Enzyme design. Structure first.
Site, PDB file in Angstrom:
ATOM      1  N   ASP A 108       0.845  -1.211   0.135  1.00  0.00           N
ATOM      2  CA  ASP A 108      -0.149   0.004   0.126  1.00  0.00           C
ATOM      3  C   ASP A 108       0.983   1.335   0.019  1.00  0.00           C
ATOM      4  O   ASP A 108       0.653   2.109  -0.719  1.00  0.00           O
ATOM      5  CB  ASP A 108      -1.026   0.171   1.000  1.00  0.00           C
ATOM      6  CG  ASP A 108      -2.215  -0.793   0.954  1.00  0.00           C
ATOM      7  OD1 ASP A 108      -2.439  -1.488  -0.180  1.00  0.00           O
ATOM      8  OD2 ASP A 108      -2.941  -1.285   1.955  1.00  0.00           O
ATOM      9  N   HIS A 143      -5.725   2.994   3.630  1.00  0.00           N
ATOM     10  CA  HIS A 143      -5.549   1.396   3.640  1.00  0.00           C
ATOM     11  C   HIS A 143      -4.145   1.092   4.384  1.00  0.00           C
ATOM     12  O   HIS A 143      -4.434   0.278   5.351  1.00  0.00           O
ATOM     13  CB  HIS A 143      -5.469   0.728   2.372  1.00  0.00           C
ATOM     14  CG  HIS A 143      -6.755   0.943   1.510  1.00  0.00           C
ATOM     15  ND1 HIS A 143      -6.729   0.694   0.121  1.00  0.00           N
ATOM     16  CD2 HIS A 143      -7.726   1.608   1.915  1.00  0.00           C
ATOM     17  CE1 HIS A 143      -7.875   1.273  -0.484  1.00  0.00           C
ATOM     18  NE2 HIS A 143      -8.397   1.699   0.550  1.00  0.00           N
ATOM     19  N   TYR A 203      -3.753  -0.839   8.909  1.00  0.00           N
ATOM     20  CA  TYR A 203      -3.099  -1.872   9.612  1.00  0.00           C
ATOM     21  C   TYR A 203      -2.326  -1.333  10.949  1.00  0.00           C
ATOM     22  O   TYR A 203      -2.497  -1.876  11.840  1.00  0.00           O
ATOM     23  CB  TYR A 203      -2.007  -2.389   8.509  1.00  0.00           C
ATOM     24  CG  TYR A 203      -2.644  -2.896   7.587  1.00  0.00           C
ATOM     25  CD1 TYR A 203      -3.475  -4.082   7.447  1.00  0.00           C
ATOM     26  CD2 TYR A 203      -2.271  -2.695   6.160  1.00  0.00           C
ATOM     27  CE1 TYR A 203      -4.044  -4.667   6.146  1.00  0.00           C
ATOM     28  CE2 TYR A 203      -2.839  -3.037   5.018  1.00  0.00           C
ATOM     29  CZ  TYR A 203      -3.965  -4.040   5.174  1.00  0.00           C
ATOM     30  OH  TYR A 203      -4.463  -4.669   4.008  1.00  0.00           O
ATOM     31  N   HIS A 260     -10.365   0.419  -7.952  1.00  0.00           N
ATOM     32  CA  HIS A 260      -9.107   0.835  -8.402  1.00  0.00           C
ATOM     33  C   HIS A 260      -8.669  -0.036  -9.696  1.00  0.00           C
ATOM     34  O   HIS A 260      -8.231   0.277 -10.626  1.00  0.00           O
ATOM     35  CB  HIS A 260      -7.911   0.828  -7.371  1.00  0.00           C
ATOM     36  CG  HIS A 260      -8.325   1.920  -6.133  1.00  0.00           C
ATOM     37  ND1 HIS A 260      -7.370   1.575  -5.049  1.00  0.00           N
ATOM     38  CD2 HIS A 260      -9.501   2.673  -5.894  1.00  0.00           C
ATOM     39  CE1 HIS A 260      -7.670   2.655  -4.155  1.00  0.00           C
ATOM     40  NE2 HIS A 260      -9.140   3.289  -4.601  1.00  0.00           N
TER      41      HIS A 260
END
Ligand SMILES: [Ca+2]
Ligand SMILES: [Ca+2]
Lengths: 319, 309
Positions: free
Chosen positions: A90, A124, A128, A218
């Site tokens: 990411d 995104h 985490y 995406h």
């Protein structure tokens, strides 16, 4: 003499700033025009991704603590490593991949949509961190960063894509930009869905579903723009670019299989994760206008895991 | 023998992907670490700009139609032209300026914050579209786009800054980035501030205030990062960079004065708009850690306009 214009359309005698900046300093620049849309698909995608804005603070990850505490240190390490690996991918896409697409846009609105993509892939990666802040010790977090830096099989994957982003071939860059959300993270997404299917970390899987609600668009959008641009090439050049897509996916599948066998070593989950990966490799090819070559045996996903993958994102989490 | 490391920390023997991509392919890449943050200011800015997320659909611009209809065709044209001019600056910032800052970031979180900036200045440009869709005729919108493309004085401003974004000097790129929301904004924002003070277009003014709320953080943040990075130069190179900032601002003030004269002269607003621009040029320099050279007389602003800053 019947069709002579009294004035010439401003659009066809000017360029977007990014065109001026990178390609042609010979014309004057036009401001984006949201009142005369060239491609209605751009407005549909813009409206969907902006309406889907979310932040990981919205999800009560603390409610995963009981089920997290039912997992041994080896499971907790696997999850922290897997998610730190997904964080790296990411970070690559947010800071390089999606922003590299802006200058190669076919339309004005596409430039702004890829700015949204880069920001949301940043969200995104940040999500985490939110999960780690609730569940993980400082030691688990640090160990996972060390493991990601020192894992040659993990590193090989982004190292294979980044050259296409920094090079001057816009179609190869676009294929790389589709492959990242379309394929490369699914081997890791398998893990939370496997665990939630068995009753563990349900709130974590809610975050994965919010991430996927973005990634599927995406993937679709980059594939859509690839198809429009490749269609303008000669038959021979179209065949060359199709060969490149299959050659690059072939290489990336090889690198992913090597990585997932190391990641899931001692858990026996590599084969299940790889089938889940190849199911998504098929959808990646379909979004670029090609046919999936993968067998039913190669792409088999347990219904319990497919239920986690396909469950709609919880709207309570929407900003 | 007392100070040997048994293992070196991962952070100091790895690079962020953007560093790997553009500068050094000799080290392995580290994932962003949001759990161990180098600069707490990054987390504060991240939280503020993400919590300030907005879309122009959520403002009832239709409620401005009565107020808009109290303006003659010349005023409606001036507003459409000014706002299309600001749309061009936001298009430059969104598509080139802010994203060019990502690879020159001091911290991992700064890379993600500049991605947010690029997206949100895209929302700013989109919000003018929303206003035009509600208030303007198709003829007014097209005329304003034609006017922007054919206005050499307007074009000169982004044409002066874009080369710094595409060149390899990160501090000159940072300054050129900050000049967009920190200086070029205010010549244009004078107009809605002026109109709001006279009781016009209150719902459009709400969009202008949402844009301003973002741009003031964009300018603070680029200024903050500029000061951190220029502090790591030799005294001689710090002096060179200060001279560059004053030289470029001098050039940009020249171009802005010429543009604002052409935009406003027919309305007699150019001198007020330029004094407003110079006041904000003073604030721009203070935001980079420099002193304002501007006189009280050449920065005079009406209290009701000054209040809206
Ligand atoms: Ca197995
Ligand atoms: Ca005057």
């Amino acid at each position: 003499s019947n069709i002579l214009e009294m004035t010439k359309n401003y659009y066809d005698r000017s360029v977007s700033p990014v065109e001026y900046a990178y390609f042609d300093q010979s014309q004057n620049m036009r401001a984006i025009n949201w009142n005369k849309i060239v491609d209605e698909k751009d407005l549909e995608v813009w409206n969907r991704v902006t309406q889907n804005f979310w932040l990981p603070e919205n999800i009560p990850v603390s409610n995963d603590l009981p089920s997290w505490n039912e997992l041994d240190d080896d499971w907790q390490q696997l999850i922290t490593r897997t998610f730190t690996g997904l964080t790296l991918l990411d970070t690559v896409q947010s800071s390089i991949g999606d922003v590299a697409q802006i200058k190669n846009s076919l339309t004005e609105q596409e430039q702004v949509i890829y700015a949204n993509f880069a920001f949301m892939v940043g969200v995104h990666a940040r999500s985490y961190g939110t999960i780690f802040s609730t569940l993980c010790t400082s030691e688990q977090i640090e160990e996972a960063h060390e493991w990601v830096v020192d894992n040659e099989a993990l590193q090989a994957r982004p190292k294979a894509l980044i050259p296409f982003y920094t090079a001057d071939d816009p179609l190869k860059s676009k294929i790389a930009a589709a492959l990242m959300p379309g394929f490369l993270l699914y081997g890791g997404f398998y893990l939370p869905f496997y665990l939630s299917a068995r009753g563990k970390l349900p709130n974590t899987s809610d975050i994965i579903r919010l991430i996927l609600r973005d990634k599927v668009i995406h993937n679709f959008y980059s594939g859509y723009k690839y198809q429009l641009k490749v269609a303008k090439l000669s038959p021979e050049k179209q065949a060359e670019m199709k060969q490149f897509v299959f050659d690059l996916l072939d290489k990336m599948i090889g690198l992913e299989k090597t990585y997932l066998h190391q990641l899931y070593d001692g858990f026996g989950l590599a084969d299940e994760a790889i089938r889940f990966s190849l199911y998504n490799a098929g959808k990646f090819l379909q979004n670029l206008g090609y046919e999936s070559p993968f067998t039913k045996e190669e792409t088999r996903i347990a219904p319990e895991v497919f239920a986690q993958l396909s469950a709609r994102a919880d709207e309570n989490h929407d900003f």
